[PDB]
Amino acid sequence: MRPSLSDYQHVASGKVRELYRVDDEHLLFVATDRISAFDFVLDTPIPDKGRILTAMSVFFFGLLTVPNHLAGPPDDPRIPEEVLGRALLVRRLDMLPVECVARGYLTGSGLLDYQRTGAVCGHVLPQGLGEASRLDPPLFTPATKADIGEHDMNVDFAAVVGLVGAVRANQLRDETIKIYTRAAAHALHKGIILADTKFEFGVDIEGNLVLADEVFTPDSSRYWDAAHYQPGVVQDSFDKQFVRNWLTGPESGWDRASDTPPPPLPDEVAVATRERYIEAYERISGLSFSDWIGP
Numbered sequence: 220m221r222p223s224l225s226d227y228q229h230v231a232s233g234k235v236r237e238l239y240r241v242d243d244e245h246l247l248f249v250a251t252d253r254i255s256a257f258d259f260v261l262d263t264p265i266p267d268k269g270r271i272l273t274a275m276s277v278f279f280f281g282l283l284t285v286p287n288h289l290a291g292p293p294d295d296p297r298i299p300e301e302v303l304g305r306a307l308l309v310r311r312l313d314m315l316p317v318e319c320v321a322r323g324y325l326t327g328s329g330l331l332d333y334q335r336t337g338a339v340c341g342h343v344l345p346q347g348l349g350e351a352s353r354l355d356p357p358l359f360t361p362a363t364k365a366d367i368g369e370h371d372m373n374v375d376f377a378a379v380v381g382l383v384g385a386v387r388a389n390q391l392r393d394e395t396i397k398i399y400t401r402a403a404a405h406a407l408h409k410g411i412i413l414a415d416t417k418f419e420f421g422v423d424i425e426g427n428l429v430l431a432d433e434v435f436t437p438d439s440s441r442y443w444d445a446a447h448y449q450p451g452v453v454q455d456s457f458d459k460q461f462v463r464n465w466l467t468g469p470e471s472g473w474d475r476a477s478d479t480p481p482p483p484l485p486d487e488v489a490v491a492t493r494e495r496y497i498e499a500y501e502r503i504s505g506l507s508f509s510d511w512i513g514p
């Protein structure tokens with residue numbers, strides 16, 4: 220018999236993910252069906268989003284050869300029925316206070332930093348780059364969490380050294396670029412560009428570096444349709460563009476310029492978005508989401 224979620228201690232709330240203590244050495248990492256757009260957690264959940272993103276993370280953990288925090292199978296008996304398929308039993312780590320970001324393409328705050336300074340996170344780049352320009356080699360563009368509402372702050376390699384040590388910073392940089400490169404090539408082979416990605420790592424009892432959190436989800440990574448990749452313009456979000464377009468379209472009644480919370484989504488937009496998540500998962504993994512476990 221699976222335990223109730225109420226049997227575990229809630230330790231951390233993200234906007235979209237939850238974390239619970241299972242015992243002294245294990246956590247329960249829970250994805251919800253909540254979706255964020257324009258830095259708002261929207262009223263309307265995307266059905267099965269938590270399950271699909273959990274399935275995606277599990278796929279990529281298996282694709283990569285590096286140590287990760289998974290501590291049991293997706294149907295581990297310690298996982299409550301209520302969160303089955305969207306929760307993982309993981310090893311408790313000492314988390315390193317660095318957002319480990321790799322960028323294979325120049326967009327978002329990376330592009331903005333470049334347009335302001337000619338550099339991103341200490342990397343002085345060629346002149347003449349622009350929106351969605353390919354970056355070769357991919358860049359390690361680390362960041363640190365800021366206050367509750369604020370975006371992460373981009374920092375350079377020296378900042379990472381000061382946070383975790385010189386040898387460890389080297390290790391973070393190398394592993395971040397290595398696993399990003401591997402996953403990005405895999406996805407592109409299936410017609411999806413992983414434009415960038417954000418990792419969190421922790422350290423286990425033996426001092427080993429361990430990949431944690433979620434990996435290569437469309438929340439942790441910019442997913443693009445490769446078939447429509449066009450450097451020089453903003454690429455559509457593979458998963459979130461229907462949501463973005465509706466929210467900023469004539470039917471929402473919402474003004475994004477106002478920092479007022481957005482209205483709920485049409486059911487059909489939520490269902491369409493769910494479909495996009497399933498398509499991305501199935502294309503990348505070569506698996507069927509209908510086989511993924513659930514309540």
Ligand SMILES: CCn1cc(-c2ncnc(N)c2C#N)cn1
Nearest residue numbers: 236238288309310311312431432
């Ligand atoms: C919800 C984001 N978050 C994850 C942790 C964490 N902490 C300790 N050990 C771990 N494996 C993890 C993970 N994943 C702390 N915040």
